[model samples]
Target: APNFIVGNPWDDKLIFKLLSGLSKPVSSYPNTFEWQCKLPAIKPKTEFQLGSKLVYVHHLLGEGAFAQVYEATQKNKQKFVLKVQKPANPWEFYIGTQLMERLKPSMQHMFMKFYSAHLFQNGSVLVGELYSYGTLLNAINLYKNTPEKVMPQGLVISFAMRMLYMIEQVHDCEIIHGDIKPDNFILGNGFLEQDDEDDLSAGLALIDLGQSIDMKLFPKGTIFTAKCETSGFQCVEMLSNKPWNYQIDYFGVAATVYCMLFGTYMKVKNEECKPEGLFRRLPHLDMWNEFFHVMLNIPDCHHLPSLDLLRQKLKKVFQQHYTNKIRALRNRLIVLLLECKRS
Candidate 1:
């Protein structure tokens, strides 16, 4: 049998002549055709009632893993962020209710407040004081690219102090903020202006409760089994599945401070990749060295570390410079008294 070859039937000369005669370039057909499609508009299941004693959800603020937050107006004309959990399993509902109960007393601070929690038809709604300014994540993103808009050290410290104060309350109540990222921190109306030399507007409200853990009820002297925590902000001990308590919050505090100073989470960058690998891949840039010290130097303990001691060490390293200017530092010290009250 003769071997056969498959080829184009058109001759090269004829094909070229056919194409070369065109005055205008022909438009090629697209690989796929564009078509218009419409989706059904979604309708809300419930409409908010105004002028009622009920907390009226005015607008949706944001969504989380287990719940959606809304900007609400109360009968008193006070604005608040209301969190509504999607219908959860029986176990989750019980846990969430318990968590809210545990957080009730801690929310009394002017910086942090939880107004009310009620069970709605679809799910449970948690009412908290609303912050019109938004979250720290929003502020960070706004100033991230603008060199002139960089957050001052004093403002950063004030924010950290406010967060630490809230954590102190949680620790005192034997509760832990399992998830402590910038998203959980909100910016309220009272931020110090750039021109204000004193910059006394250091008040902040700590929000979000879906990932909180009740330390008193949790298994004691055993490894913590909770899966709730942010990856880059959580300490190595928390990540390693070791027994954790209030110290977990400390790790989050450190991570927050690190982000404020360095503009990135240290653990996020160095968690899996090795220093050698980073250098080999990007020879132009320096290898991450700060996190190595942060990981090795910070002692992991079951009990909450002394805030004073931690602050002292941070100052020794020049990281505490911002803490001095934070307006909430004194308030945090006062709140630390609550830790003893709980014990």
Candidate 2:
């Protein structure tokens, strides 16, 4: 008699044992499942043995010069985003673990949830939650594609607050996310549900920790420096690789918010900042410009960016600009409560 399995065999949990012991100096499996006792010393290996179970890459999510992210699934049930890159770098795993270990339970959800990590001879894999909603860049493109639709003040304020709080919390942890862009800010699950529930920070999840730095590792009052190059998102000092610190993250947040709101990259050249694109037909554009100015033009590297001040400014923009807009809607009760307190 033949043995039979029901449903998805991969999800059986025990079925992993059948595939766990395999022979052949192999790099491929029939169903993309393999059992390797150890990480293979190979380059561009797709499938990985994360433990007893295997992770299979389905398709590419996005890629850059050094890293490639793929949408993968394990047990054919749990979907995750896997980032594969050279194993030499340790900053991402280190910073990710530090963020997980140090951030308060309430604040941890704003960042990506690290699930597992494996090192291969040529590649490294970092597995984490699959943010199905994609990046803020998607949202920006949606608005860009249809210029007639202006992003509502409430939603804009929500993103602004979330970015500020997100970066603020990271600084509190003494970590700086060196690369902050719209592409790096992904929408986590329940992102829309929370927004409907009047939680501004609901779906915003920050990704791409490779460029991050742990300020806590630096000696007190010491100048922090790195060969930083973020193209359009760098501050004036960062352009010259001058002493940089947590303020760079603020610059990123500022650039990201400007891009989301205005549908364009916030350009900074020779300390001059400019937002180019079809502008949102919203009130207080001047206020936003001033906010960006203060944020992007940090006087010096050591100066701490005022997150509270920026948050307060953003709140004023929403309260004053969106008051009539929110009042026009029947469901202002939840909106009112949501805006009153966010320290």
Candidate 3:
């Protein structure tokens, strides 16, 4: 019998099952179901005021260690994301401010538009464009169980190309995205919606500049104990606290692509690559390999290429694998890769 599960809206048991698979204890949270139920209603104290000349905070979109993002309506009736943080989180505050101050003057086209950063009463808020769809991390999670719903290979390739281009720009300006993962990338349209093949707006954008680094200021030997990124995605260099240049972005971009294709986190096994077991059951290994080659291992071998060149190479791979029978190609490639590993 086919699984008829539609949307698992706030399914406590389902959430617990998934979280447990990730090695978290089910009993860690005493009232998991209750907490899930209250997610949409329990608003944090960081509320936004109505009308303001600087920027109008509309509603809370999301929150993180550094700040909470608000959907803001500007004086000109324009919408933007307002990231607010208390003075207490000084490191986070400094990161956001430094990113804006560094990139605004030199690498404007490469980054998200920064409007203003100001303090109000108890905390400070950073204002910028309000992306409607939300973070790429949400997309990955939404599609994790539904491989059929994953975006086309071409779209994934294009996303990687754009991300690599952004990395090049950041590196040229001597900046590094210390923390790069699915959460830091934002999708333009809802991930549940299929993308129009012709529309660029259906694509994804990189966001969350709070952890970026100015390599010029902090040279190779700058000692720091901070664990810079989320688990399951940090590069070997980042984990070891080794000096990293722009190549860190490559490893991150690769991890992101791997997650999108396999619907699971990419894991390193015995110095060889292995997709999640469930993904291996799918049919397409060659196509997945091509995508992985570009996303994971390519940047480690060469310096970041120009945006146009990167796109061109990615397009070639897309044309080869995705132009026809994309779904079949993906499933077949997965199966083949798994069989090869077993042999």
Candidate 4:
């Protein structure tokens, strides 16, 4: 309800209005009119026809009404992904480049490493290193096909925290990962990599951030509208048409974790394989209740102990990882600064 803002919510006036309230209008909406302008008269056949060449389209990996994702390659057969966002949704193009040209120079890991974006006869082509390992859904299905439909529950926490951590980083960049779901939490071939712990240790790569909003463009990423989210995962707040914000991501984590453990998103009705009795889905219910109550008034009472205990556990793990990440990033920045100075 709140997160879904329908149709051209941006007008020059609305843009400036939202921008002025955000504290830093410059970085927020650097050139408002550019975003509001009409798309070019025609589209490109391939995102690469513009001149430079580093990647070539191999084949269509997937397609949708709004975009087509292709498996692609570079020199030496190095692999990558190319997503061609149809110009039919002209507004989506900037949200696309806002990656490579925008927040990219500042952020890392949480998004695909910047490559290049180009216009084509029918759409815009976005290129980046391919994380073809698949999505969390694919990962869970692989785990599901195993004995007892068993998956490492710890991995659920790992994925959940990393999702939250990724959201925090994206938000820090003033970007809202507008669409948060297993579908968009595109996984790398990490599971195929030599490192067995990559699933937990590797973290997530956010994709199709097209719905992403510039926080200054809206007060705290609450642009008030959207959801065709995979059935049970949609938040009640979103369903009820309420004004939503970053907290909606908490619901994303809760739903994502449910799928990780039970192989299904939690629903309003009783689950077929209820985790509480068989494996004690207590922690998840607590996690769900804790945040759901705040965001959409879901209640909490009995499971708070398991919930409180897990809160500290996940908090510790996430904090340690976040601290390590910040430390490493600071070191890297210092190195880059020194190199810049040398030059």
Best by TM-score: 2
The collision pairs in model 1 are: 80-130
lDDT, candidates in the order shown: 0.47, 0.63, 0.51, 0.51
Candidate 4 lDDT, 161-241, residue by residue in tens: 566556655655655565566667666544333233332435358776545566545433244444434332555555555
Candidate with best lDDT: 2
Tell me each candidate's TM-score.
0.60, 0.74, 0.61, 0.63
Instruction: For candidate 3, write residues 147-220 as lDDT tens digits.
Output: 55665555466556667656665666665676677878865322224333321223355776555554444434
* Residue-level lDDT tens digits of model 2 in 1-343: 2222122211324223332433421134121222334444222336655657666667677888568888877722887887877643334666687787678889886777776666555566677788876677766665544433544556677678878888888888888787899899877555534433342557578888766765555456545444455343556555666665667677788778777666677765552554444256646767777777788667675567688888887777676656556433314323333332231
Q: Per-residue error at 193 for model 4, in Å? A: 5.2
Q: Which digits, one per residue and each the tens of the lDDT, describe model 1 over residues 40-134?
A: 11113334532235444566668766667777665247766656665521222233444445665645543455544444344555556667666
